[PDB]
């Protein structure tokens, strides 16, 4: 099935509090597996995911220095922006970037991205044609003319179309036993009193990995959606997640309500009823 | 254009000296470098920069100090000089991984300054035999006794330059321990040599010392100057 | 981020094929490049192989194939032709932006003439009587001009020349000497044809 390798880069200026923080965090299927932090014991790319242990020393030192380079790189970027933006050094700002590629079960290349965000905002990004540029404001433009005219798109596309993929594939080969393992949700309902002789019953989904998952309540057949309660899935602590949905119902009607639980680790969706 | 400027072009000075070989930029690349070309190692990096305010060490930094004031300008410093430093540099920019190098620079760090000597140029005229033999003439030029080996030779016929029929030697072959020689040649038809309406000058450019620069005693100062040794075509008989 | 050109100096007949070998060591796939250093010039770009296809197509018959198999980005050509004699630099770029060059290779292209007439002459500075100057010229490039091991007598190595005339690529070796009495014939110990400084009667 489709997979991907993204890299979340980030650097925040520290006007007064020393050299701004810069971080590099990679992800395979949104699974952090490796990171570098300018503010750790001794900044270095380190293995997050356990299967990374299969890479040797060269690997680390390599990315590590790469990091060190990229670090300085953005450090200046900070200034640059301040310039396009005529900002007062004083306050602090932030830069984040989305680097990654998506491949199919064939090995073909689904999509390639490069997203530049300043102070929680879209600054500039590579189109899907992996050749042009999309700016956001005056600033980005100056950054486009300049960017493009250095052959930027080209070298970028190389990585995406190629490097990115040689690795994404490599990683997978070493961490499949992990990556797409299965953890089944354990559900159950709970009934809660409420004034006016009504009630809320909320459906629980606990102990499940991955995290994507939809859950519903049904009008004994209809899409009981328009009026419910949902909570962004949440990280348990041991790699699993949790989530619940619910709504009010009149007493003596509970049992006439069905909850459904959809999760790729379920041989069949789940049906809860009070 | 698409290129990088690097001037001064040629420079010589005594130890302890301090020069500032600069460099401009007409290509908005952020990155900039300074390599050191010497035989035996090829180019070697000293200092590069990701833009204003950036200056990060390279492989051979000792004795050098880079400075990135403005995206466009990038220059190297050598507070205290040293003949170990005598070489050919190039600053280079590079918007990604596609570097662009500049003309270059000849810095010779002599200990003793009045140890230089302008060239001595002299245009030898063609073997008559050559002419009978091959119907072509060949004025062969040889320059001698100059030390800063920073010289450029060019052939001038009737006022204009000429690159065709020329074979100016690669670099300067050290004559003796303190002087070199550059021998270049030109070769026109015999028809051409035989017309006294032709003019043939062989000239050498020699980068000597500054104006603003101290020259002792009374003898002539080895500054920048062009030495030429002309010759005139003569008819046979 | 290392690079290594095994040969510092190559030499090959004009119009032949070319093999400039590079090698490197980098635990990944460092960027590869090929530059040319001419006479009084600055490095010029010929290639760059970021990734993907191992065979790059650069300007003028120059192409190099990348090879993770034996770590190498050899720039080769088919019929190298004279104007292409010079020094070529291989180059990588990994950890950081700067390039890393190798000692480089000095390849040389011997041009040919369908009619070599290896002659020798004497010319004199019409402004310093006695100034001797021998000139070897128009000889087959497959011969290596004898050198010298005596002070006040040097020999500029073979330098190629070309006139605005079809088959005019000529050759040049200069040899001077200040040793009292010394006739060219003695320096050009063993070559061919040494016509007399004696001007043919009018």
């Amino acid at each position: 099935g489709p997979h991907s390798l993204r890299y979340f880069v980030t650097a925040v200026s520290r006007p007064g509090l020393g050299e701004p923080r810069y971080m590099e965090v990679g992800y395979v299927d949104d699974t952090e597996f490796v990171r570098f932090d300018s503010d750790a014991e001794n900044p270095r790319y380190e293995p997050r995911a356990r299967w990374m242990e299969q890479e040797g020393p060269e690997y680390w030192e390599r990315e590590t220095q790469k990091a060190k380079g990229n670090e300085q790189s953005f450090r200046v970027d900070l200034r640059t922006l301040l310039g396009y933006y005529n900002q007062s050094k004083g306050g602090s700002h932030t830069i984040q970037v989305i680097s990654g590629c998506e491949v199919g079960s064939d090995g073909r290349l689904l999509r390639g991205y490069q997203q530049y965000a300043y102070d929680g905002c879209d600054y500039i990004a590579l189109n899907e044609d992996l050749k042009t540029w999309t700016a956001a404001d005056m600033a980005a433009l100056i950054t486009k003319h300049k960017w493009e005219q250095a052959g930027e798109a080209e070298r970028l596309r190389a990585y995406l179309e190629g490097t990115c993929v040689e690795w994404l594939r490599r990683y997978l080969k070493n961490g499949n036993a992990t990556l797409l393992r299965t953890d089944s949700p354990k559900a159950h309902v709970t009934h809660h009193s409420r004034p006016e002789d009504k009630v809320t019953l909320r459906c629980w989904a606990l102990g499940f990995y991955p995290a994507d998952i939809t859950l519903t309540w049904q009008l004994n057949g209809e899409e009981l959606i328009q009026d419910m309660e949902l909570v962004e899935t949440r990280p348990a602590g041991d790699g699993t997640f949790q989530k619940w949905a619910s709504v009010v119902v009149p007493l003596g009607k509970e049992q006439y309500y069905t909850c459904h639980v959809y999760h790729q680790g379920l041989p069949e969706p789940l049906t809860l009823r009070w | 254009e698409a290129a990088v400027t690097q001037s001064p072009r040629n420079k010589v000075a005594v130890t302890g000296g301090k020069v500032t070989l600069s460099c401009n930029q007409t290509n908005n690349h952020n990155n900039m470098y300074w390599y050191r070309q010497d035989t035996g190692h090829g180019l070697r990096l000293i200092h590069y920069s990701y833009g204003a305010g950036s200056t990060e060490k390279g492989d051979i930094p000792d004795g050098y100090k880079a400075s990135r004031p403005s995206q466009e300008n990038f220059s190297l410093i050598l507070e205290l000089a040293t003949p170990s430093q005598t070489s050919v540099y190039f600053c280079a920019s590079g918007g990604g991984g596609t570097l662009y190098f500049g003309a270059g620079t000849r810095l010779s760090v002599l200990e003793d300054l009045r140890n230089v000597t302008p060239p001595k140029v002299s245009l030898f005229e063609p073997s008559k035999a050559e002419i009978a033999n091959k119907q072509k003439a060949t004025l062969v030029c040889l320059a001698r006794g100059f030390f800063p080996d920073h010289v450029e030779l060019s052939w001038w016929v009737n006022g204009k330059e000429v690159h065709s029929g020329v074979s100016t030697d690669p670099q300067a072959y050290k004559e003796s321990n303190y002087s070199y020689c550059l021998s270049s040649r030109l070769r026109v038809s015999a028809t051409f040599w035989h017309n006294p309406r032709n003019h043939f000058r062989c000239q050498v450019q020699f980068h000597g010392l500054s104006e603003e620069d101290k020259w002792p005693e009374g003898s002539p100062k080895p500054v920048t100057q062009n030495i030429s040794a002309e010759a005139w075509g003569r008819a046979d008989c | 981020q290392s690079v290594t050109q095994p040969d510092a100096r190559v030499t090959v007949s004009e119009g032949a094929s070319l093999q400039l070998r590079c090698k490197y060591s980098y635990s990944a796939t460092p960027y590869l490049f090929w530059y040319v250093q001419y006479p009084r010039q600055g490095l010029q770009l010929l290639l760059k192989y970021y990734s993907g296809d191992p065979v790059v197509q650069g300007v003028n018959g120059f192409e190099a194939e990348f090879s993770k198999s034996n770590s190498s980005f050899h720039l080769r050509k088919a019929s190298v032709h004279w104007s292409d004699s010079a020094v070529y630099f291989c180059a990588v770029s990994g950890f950081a932006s700067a390039l890393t060059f190798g000692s480089g290779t000095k390849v040389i292209v011997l041009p040919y003439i369908q009619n070599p007439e290896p002659a020798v002459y004497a010319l004199k500075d019409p402004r310093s009587q006695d100034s001797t100057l021998c000139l070897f010229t128009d000889f087959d490039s497959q011969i290596n001009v004898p050198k010298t091991m005596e002070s006040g007598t040097f020999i500029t190595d073979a330098t190629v020349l070309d006139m605005k005339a079809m088959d005019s690529k000529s050759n040049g070796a200069i040899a001077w000497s200040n040793q009292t009495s010394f006739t060219c014939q003695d320096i050009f110990k063993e070559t061919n044809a040494t016509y007399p400084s004696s001007d043919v009667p009018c």
Binding site: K66, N70, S73, S99, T143, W147, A150, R155 | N30 | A28
Partner: peptide, 8 residues
């Protein structure tokens, strides 16, 4: 390995 970004 991640890319090797170029300035803004």
């Amino acid at each position: 390995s991640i890319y090797r970004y170029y300035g803004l």
